[PDB]
Design an enzyme around this catalytic site. Sequence first.
Site, PDB file in Angstrom:
ATOM      1  CB  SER A 172      -0.912   0.048   1.225  1.00 35.15           C
ATOM      2  OG  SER A 172      -1.904  -0.980   1.176  1.00 35.15           O
TER       3      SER A 172
ATOM      4  CB  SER B 295      -4.381   1.044   3.053  1.00 32.33           C
ATOM      5  OG  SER B 295      -3.271   1.779   3.572  1.00 32.33           O
TER       6      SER B 295
ATOM      7  CD1 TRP C 204       0.971  -7.580   6.198  1.00 34.59           C
ATOM      8  CD2 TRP C 204      -0.808  -7.064   7.450  1.00 34.59           C
ATOM      9  NE1 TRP C 204       0.678  -8.678   6.985  1.00 34.59           N
ATOM     10  CE2 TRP C 204      -0.406  -8.379   7.766  1.00 34.59           C
ATOM     11  CE3 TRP C 204      -1.921  -6.523   8.102  1.00 34.59           C
ATOM     12  CZ2 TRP C 204      -1.072  -9.154   8.718  1.00 34.59           C
ATOM     13  CZ3 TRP C 204      -2.590  -7.302   9.034  1.00 34.59           C
ATOM     14  CH2 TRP C 204      -2.125  -8.578   9.376  1.00 34.59           C
TER      15      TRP C 204
ATOM     16  NE  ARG D  17       1.549  -2.488  10.303  1.00 37.86           N
ATOM     17  CZ  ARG D  17       0.586  -2.292   9.408  1.00 37.86           C
ATOM     18  NH1 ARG D  17       0.851  -2.239   8.100  1.00 37.86           N
ATOM     19  NH2 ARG D  17      -0.660  -2.124   9.817  1.00 37.86           N
TER      20      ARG D  17
HETATM   21  C1  LIG Z   1      -1.631  -2.249   1.748  1.00 35.37           C
HETATM   22  O1  LIG Z   1      -0.506  -2.535   2.159  1.00 35.37           O
HETATM   23  C2  LIG Z   1      -2.810  -3.180   1.966  1.00 35.37           C
HETATM   24  C3  LIG Z   1      -3.507  -2.782   3.259  1.00 35.37           C
HETATM   25  N1  LIG Z   1      -2.570  -2.312   4.251  1.00 35.37           N
HETATM   26  C4  LIG Z   1      -2.953  -2.600   5.492  1.00 35.37           C
HETATM   27  C5  LIG Z   1      -2.204  -2.107   6.638  1.00 35.37           C
HETATM   28  O2  LIG Z   1      -2.594  -2.370   7.885  1.00 35.37           O
HETATM   29  O3  LIG Z   1      -1.195  -1.425   6.451  1.00 35.37           O
HETATM   30  C6  LIG Z   1      -3.997  -3.432   5.483  1.00 35.37           C
HETATM   31  S1  LIG Z   1      -4.832  -4.017   6.827  1.00 35.37           S
HETATM   32  C7  LIG Z   1      -6.539  -3.704   6.506  1.00 35.37           C
HETATM   33  C8  LIG Z   1      -6.773  -2.210   6.332  1.00 35.37           C
HETATM   34  N2  LIG Z   1      -7.059  -1.707   7.682  1.00 35.37           N
HETATM   35  C9  LIG Z   1      -7.789  -2.796   8.372  1.00 35.37           C
HETATM   36  C10 LIG Z   1      -7.474  -2.802   9.864  1.00 35.37           C
HETATM   37  N3  LIG Z   1      -8.545  -2.062  10.557  1.00 35.37           N
HETATM   38  S2  LIG Z   1      -7.958  -0.778  11.327  1.00 35.37           S
HETATM   39  N4  LIG Z   1      -7.117  -1.296  12.597  1.00 35.37           N
HETATM   40  O4  LIG Z   1      -9.060   0.033  11.758  1.00 35.37           O
HETATM   41  O5  LIG Z   1      -7.120  -0.013  10.446  1.00 35.37           O
HETATM   42  C11 LIG Z   1      -7.385  -4.102   7.706  1.00 35.37           C
HETATM   43  C12 LIG Z   1      -4.275  -3.848   4.064  1.00 35.37           C
HETATM   44  C13 LIG Z   1      -3.730  -5.250   3.861  1.00 35.37           C
HETATM   45  C14 LIG Z   1      -3.787  -3.105   0.802  1.00 35.37           C
HETATM   46  C15 LIG Z   1      -3.131  -3.372  -0.546  1.00 35.37           C
HETATM   47  O6  LIG Z   1      -4.814  -4.076   1.041  1.00 35.37           O
END
Ligand SMILES: *C(=O)[C@@H]([C@@H]1NC(C(=O)O)=C(S[C@@H]2CN[C@H](CNS(N)(=O)=O)C2)[C@@H]1C)[C@@H](C)O
Length: 239
Positions: A45, A92, A185, A225
């Site tokens: 991301s 993201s 991630w 992180r």
């Molecule tokens: C990009 O890398 C990817 C994103 N990135 C992330 C991340 O945590 O960096 C996720 S996790 C996903 C998004 N936020 C959710 C967690 N809830 S919260 N704690 O309120 O933020 C789960 C995801 C894999 C893209 C390409 O999907």
Amino acid sequence: EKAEKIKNLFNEVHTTGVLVIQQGQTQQSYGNDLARASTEYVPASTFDMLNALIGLEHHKATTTEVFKWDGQKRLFPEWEKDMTLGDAMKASALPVYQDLARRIGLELMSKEVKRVGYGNADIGTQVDNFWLVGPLKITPQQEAQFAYKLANKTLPFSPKVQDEVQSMLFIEEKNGNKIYAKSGWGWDVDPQVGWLTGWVVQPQGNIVAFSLNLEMKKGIPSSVRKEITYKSLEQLGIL
Ligand SMILES: *C(=O)[C@@H]([C@@H]1NC(C(=O)O)=C(S[C@@H]2CN[C@H](CNS(N)(=O)=O)C2)[C@@H]1C)[C@@H](C)O
């Protein structure tokens, strides 16, 4: 003493990682595997930052347009909402940035990624996933440099577009410090990669860029992180 303490922050959560810090034109590395600093990983991301710069610069999107949720189930429930580019940056939200990548198109995307010299600058033939599963890769040193230039508005884009993308990345003002950051991630690559790339603007005006890069494992919460980053920056006197 500070470097030892940061090394142990990574040891404490039972994975390996590095934190690259950039001030001026020099970088320092901290953590329990410093060699990660010069190792290439998928940006996941974190690429959204450059995607946004390219999209705005070439008038493929605006900062105010709304990407409406169409009601179809998304990979994460956090993505199931109307979003600007900035909202999508913070969440993201991949589908928004895939939409943007398609608007930009392969030719322009490839030209711009090469022009800016981002990572290995290899995007292959698939315009909507090249930052997730390869072939694009980038080192933590390169991510820290990229963040430092964005922070100083010295990337090769208009100042307006760099200002706009900065605004998308703003997290909080904490003890007078403005904190900008983008997490990533890459969970469907092996081993998994976790990113937190950004910068701090201190009250006196000084900019300190950072990129955290660690191996994400089952049983390590994603909140590690931000926790390790903030604690390390506090140890270093940056926050
Ligand atoms: C990009 O890398 C990817 C994103 N990135 C992330 C991340 O945590 O960096 C996720 S996790 C996903 C998004 N936020 C959710 C967690 N809830 S919260 N704690 O309120 O933020 C789960 C995801 C894999 C893209 C390409 O999907």
